[PDB]
Symmetry: C5
Subunit: 331 residues, 5 copies
């Protein structure tokens, strides 16, 4: 019965409008993040979705209790009757606190007056990407934490636990990406309305080439290899050799144009676009070679036979040399 | 009156009224003492969907929680009180949440699909109808001859093992409706209930765990990918029976079967999430590519030699007619035995 | 002024927590449905969307009024101050009450104490479908109405108007389906927590073949006729006759694989698949016929000429016979 | 200070449950709509989206004020404390009142006690369409406005401004459609629960052929012209002439099947399907013509040469005649 | 302590229904926008999405305080207890105030009685587009700010900071577009219910040709170059030369029809559409040339040989001339 009256004494005459230490020193909010998952990474909408346990820790002397030598875990609905920091994710596209079975919210009071406030949030944050080196690229995605209305005079942010404040980054299971590094940053960003406290979480994503080797690289190598079958077919076979030319020239064009439609409409040329343009030149030259052989074999059969003979070794050699130059330059 | 008229609505009203007078929702039952024991019960209405692309699944269920709140015990009435669901907003309830939940919701037509039943001893029966999209990370190395394990992780959001304790009410028979699941592409092979106490920085937390073992039905894949592969490979063999004078015809069969094979593999890969490994089906489709590419190389070779060596060329076409179907049957036999 | 003091005295001391006749006989709720539309029927998500006027009728003696000889239509917000049945659709996926300009909700009180409670709901209900006979199939879709918390001891459901309780089923405008029949059912489903009242609405949907004749059947018949043009072309024409073979054999494969992707991933074989597999055998045999003629015309020109001669009559005859057997068996 | 106390005493003892003139003559609500836009028209989901300023006007004597000779514009939140008509859109699929920065809501009181109530609503309304004449079709789309719970005994609806009640129909910017006409209708629809007031807004949409000429009509003409190139190619060219025949026949079937997938699964034949079927017969006959010429040129070279000579004039002539008959019949 | 009580007297007997200076001169609301991002630009739904910090400044004498010589930042929930302008975006399709961890809302009181009210809004606004010059086109997209219920007699709007009221336009990272200019406008739009205050923010977007050069222009140039290979192939090669004709003619048709499906169903013809119609004519004429050569080479082999050797120079020349005329006309 003592503990019942105590909680009621705390909130008696409590004004939510006023932050703790209202006219005095700034309230120091300690942030802690446990990353549950990186649900998705989109190049098309140049963003990523993250689910986390967002924990905030500050003192409110108005909530201090003398009698009880225990930490009080109160039903989450009490958060609607308390002052809480106006923390927001500056680079947020859409966010939400999970609400089944209850609001995924936690309030834990300490006799000191300190509050532990937990929220389970799913956030889709913006991540502008440079796809020049795609698919052999690294992306830096961040989560920008800030106060919406309170300046550095009223509110101060800090990572509670220092470099060990954010957890669960190593248990992230992204199939196409691998978290290579993550960094915590504390700043005070100056604006027209004053200086604001800022926390910053950043991770560096490294793309896994596997999918691209199987989807784009192997189909391009095979189309180029299929273009070389023509040099072993009799030059009398005009339809067969032109059919091989047309087929491999168009299939390359569609491999390049298709891949471009799977990504956002960027105006620059990607690493994979350089490879495919190379492959186009090699399959277009095989067809020009037949056109040239077809144009000369009547008057110069020996020369025509020779051009097909040389094409059989020059083309595979030059393509191996192109792959060697390309893959060494990018790695 | 030690026993009161159950039909006296005025006595029930004033009884329920004194129960909630001075009741603090902030405080859990037995606030400073032993933990409150919540008994969980799930009746699975359906497994609405299973997505490989977003590596998740969706289930609809009747989620029931059971606990005793002595503050809600009543002496007069010899009946269990079914109160209008809106009373749940005036009572303390466990902060139960699904740890691996992506999106969830309680159904709200015609009213919130929730139920409160009070018992004279103070026990509360609390029901909710939830739809949950939960994460299910999948290993598609053996796809489409694979099995997946999908779970539902139940936990307390703010209360530690010192304040709340979870248990499956009914033991192994706590979760029902699993046998009534109608999934067209999957079959529930087994399900397991688990009770734990997961340790974290903020303390030990009670955890209940529901698990399924989903087995994929090969039927769709046989008709969509396997039979079209077998037919394109059979198509590539028609070339060996066509006169080697027919350069366009035989190269057209080669090109057609070689490209169709490439598109069967690349298409299937786009229907799934961008995984970097090679699936069971990819091994089969790569095999079929090698068989359809060799038939074209065989014509290239025959075309290259039939002027100077017509007998040899005729023989290579003669042998290809038996070697190719034999080796493909042997490949099918090795693949299907290895994977089953 | 009298009618104003009347409504106030009705809700004074009213306990919303308690159902009418709280400790006595069950309250009898009379359900009535006007179907505004069957907005959609999905095979892919095996469900259907329906919009309706859902009306419930029950008597609450606490709401009886003596003076007024009129039925009182009160502003819908009064429903938040009254007890209402906890009616829910057991097989719904998502549902909602329309909210513009106000909640599409209606409360009509009767001097008796009877309440008429109306709601305009859009419901996406589950409808598991058997597509073995697709597209010559009939589907049975239902709407399962139940009490969420009250057992048969507290609530009883009934169709108000009997067989004429559900209206607007005959004015349903589905382009691909036709409502052939609908049935109303009353039950008491037994569960662990007790017996529950259940009302059940069912429809029998009949698919319209029209779309399929134009999209799948006619393209199959034409691709099969196209394959017969080969038998009239000179056997010297190896490319032409193999081109017709390849073209018709692949087009057949894509007609079947495409249709399968438009539907959910079922493991069985549909009615349309038996027709399309038939067409595949007919187009594959036309190509084997050319292969056979191409294989023999040097040594046996007369026989080759004869095989082409017979193919011209046997193939159209056997295909007509296949169509006749298929359609008679399925109708 | 006098105006401050006037508004407070306005709502003193006011019951929102009770409509104005509760036991007497019906309240006359005057509706008036300014259409901001017709955001979209979908054939697939057979509906259209519309954004508008929905204004309602009625007199509530409980809200009359004596002292002030001005019209009072009160903060929109006051609408939650007043009785408002239960107006709803009968053929509505989904609707919403815009909520940024505030609810797009307006309350203007008049000394008389008259209320001007404004709402900015986006509505997706159903529009069942007849696509038999598509894309030379005209569709009639309506907005059905009704009272949800109040009968003609309690509420009466009317268009405030008569034929000039709905504005902004002439400034509608639909790229594929043109508003040809619009009509306002006032009725009293009889139902089981009584007679209800109904306002009806109807507009007649006319489709713009431009897109279809470029997307379907021109590619069909060009594929049919491509089919005629065959008659000028030597009949010795079996592969070339069969390749033109296969190509034109198949691309024609894909033009028809593709267009059908862009629209809802209707079982009937559209105006554009009649044209495309005609085109198919013309491309299929060009191929049969080659089959016939290929079948006879050995024994009858003169006849074969003649059939190709005639095909060069008969086919373009008959196609021009088909276009003339088609376009005249449909316009 | 004293500050707790001063705010409580401020709101005692305060009527939210009544705007500041009710019945007197119209309240002057000073608008300020900090553009966080232009998230997307859609031609299909002819709209654009924008996220911003929307700030409003007005004076409410009812909220003046004497004791405290400080500006009071109150918990955002106090906005529900104050009068606020009924500001709305006239050309808005869907909008929302961000709500994690709290409503991204800010109230800052000044001893004077002025109020600083901030909101972080994501707005999908309509932008009707003229695609006649697509993809070498400029689009003007606007954000129309208005009062929903209050006339110019009760509310007046103004850009707080003049030409420097809207910030962050230069920091916009659009991959396919570049903000070339932006303009602020103040008006008083007259309607049936009276004159209304209107602020207007306008952007001029310039499309980056890069993507289109790689996706549509280069594949067209490559397909017409492919069509020219036919003139170097022996006229005896009927299948080969007809295969090149059919292939290039159909690929050209799909490049044009595909692009049309990526955009909204407009009835006019775009700048690419006329380039792509030109390429079709070049590519169809190469096939007619073979048909003509195939039709005459028996009786006139010399003439046929000549038509192929002229086609080899006339076609590439004429196509360069088409590109010169088209690209000069469209740069004007
Ligand atoms: C991802 O990108 C961001 C932004 O480009 C990187 O953030 C930057 O991180 C460094 C710390 O690693 C910060 O620099 C520090 O500045 C202080 C004060 O000048 C100095 O004393 C330190 O020695 C250090 O240089 C920097 O402020 C910060 N930039 C911003 C604006 O956030 C981030 O590190 C990258 N993360 C990963 C994992 O790649
Ligand atoms: C699906 O996967 C999960 C996780 O891999 C499986 O859960 C595991 O289930 C077993 C019981 O079958 C638990 O092990 C038990 O541990 C106790 C205490 O050490 C021991 O006394 C028992 O003999 C038994 O080994 C295990 O804790 C649990 N793992 C977790 C973390 O949940 C689940 O069984 C799989 N379900 C299906 C149907 O395949
Ligand atoms: C759609 O499918 C449902 C479920 O398969 C059909 O519902 C069934 O309807 C019949 C009435 O037509 C019910 O049977 C009756 O049972 C009573 C009591 O045993 C008996 O006296 C009657 O003679 C009759 O047999 C049956 O209970 C009911 N099943 C369930 C579980 O709902 C429905 O009729 C089908 N509707 C259409 C329109 O095809
Ligand atoms: C769009 O379609 C609707 C429904 O088919 C048309 O509505 C009809 O409009 C006319 C007035 O133009 C109404 O008819 C009138 O009835 C009275 C009483 O019988 C008679 O005195 C008049 O001479 C006239 O015939 C009719 O009630 C109404 N139908 C309904 C049920 O709404 C509408 O006109 C079409 N709109 C456009 C712009 O094409
Ligand atoms: C985007 O398009 C809009 C609308 O077409 C352009 O808005 C127009 O902007 C000018 C100012 O640049 C306004 O004109 C001014 O009118 C006053 C009064 O007549 C005059 O004193 C000034 O000298 C000036 O001419 C005009 O009212 C305004 N139109 C509307 C209705 O908003 C806008 O400038 C374009 N923005 C960009 C960045 O391209
Ligand atoms: C209360 O919580 C704090 C962490 O802030 C810790 O130091 C202490 O051990 C806890 N005390 C009790 C009573 O368990
Ligand atoms: C019903 O209960 C009330 C107590 O609230 C009491 O006044 C009354 O005596 C009881 N029964 C009757 C109808 O006498
Ligand atoms: C009340 O509920 C319990 C189940 O918890 C059961 O034992 C008992 O039979 C019920 N009693 C009544 C009064 O029906
Ligand atoms: C009141 O409603 C009932 C239907 O439940 C009907 O019998 C009666 O006619 C109505 N009475 C009045 C006053 O209109
Ligand atoms: C008040 O509004 C009415 C329109 O209903 C109009 O007749 C009148 O002029 C307005 N009066 C004032 C005081 O402006
Ligand atoms: C209060 O805010 C204003 C900006 O409106 C500024 O001029 C002034 O410096 C601030 N005063 C204090 C007390 O910091
Ligand atoms: Cl959620
Ligand atoms: Cl729902
Ligand atoms: Cl709605
Ligand atoms: Cl909105
Ligand atoms: Cl948000």
């Amino acid at each position: 019965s003592f503990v019942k009256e105590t909680v009621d004494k705390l909130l008696k005459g409590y004004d939510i409008r006023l932050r703790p230490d209202f006219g005095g020193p700034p309230v120091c909010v300690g942030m802690n993040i446990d990353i549950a998952s990186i649900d998705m990474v989109s190049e098309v909408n140049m963003d990523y979705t993250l689910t986390m346990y967002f924990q905030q820790y500050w003192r409110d002397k108005r909530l201090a209790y003398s009698g009880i030598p225990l930490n009080l875990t109160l039903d989450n609905r009490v958060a609607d009757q308390l002052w809480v920091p106006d923390t927001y994710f500056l680079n947020d596209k859409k966010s939400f606190v999970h609400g089944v079975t209850v609001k995924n919210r936690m309030i834990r009071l300490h006799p000191d007056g300190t509050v532990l406030y937990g929220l389970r949030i799913t956030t889709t944050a913006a991540c502008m990407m440079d796809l020049r080196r795609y698919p052999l690229d690294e992306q830096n995605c961040t989560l920008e934490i800030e106060s919406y209305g309170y300046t550095t005079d009223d509110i101060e942010f800090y990572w509670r636990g220092g470099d060990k404040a954010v957890t669960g980054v190593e248990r992230i299971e992204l199939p196409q990406f691998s978290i290579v590094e993550h960094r915590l940053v504390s700043r005070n960003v100056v604006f027209a309305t004053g200086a604001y406290p800022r926390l910053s979480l950043s991770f560096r994503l490294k793309r896994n080439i596997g999918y691209f080797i199987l989807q784009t690289y192997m189909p391009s190598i095979l189309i180029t290899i299929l273009s070389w079958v023509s040099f072993w077919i009799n030059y009398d076979a005009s339809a067969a050799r032109v059919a091989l030319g047309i087929t491999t020239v168009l299939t390359m064009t569609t491999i390049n144009t298709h891949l471009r439609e799977t990504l956002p409409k960027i105006p620059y040329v990607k690493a994979i676009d350089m490879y495919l343009m190379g492959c186009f030149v090699f399959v277009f030259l095989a067809l020009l070679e037949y056109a040239f052989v077809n144009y000369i074999f009547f008057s110069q059969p020996a020369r025509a036979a020779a051009i097909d003979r040389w094409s059989r070794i020059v083309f595979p050699f030059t393509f191996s040399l192109f792959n060697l130059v390309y893959w060494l330059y990018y790695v």
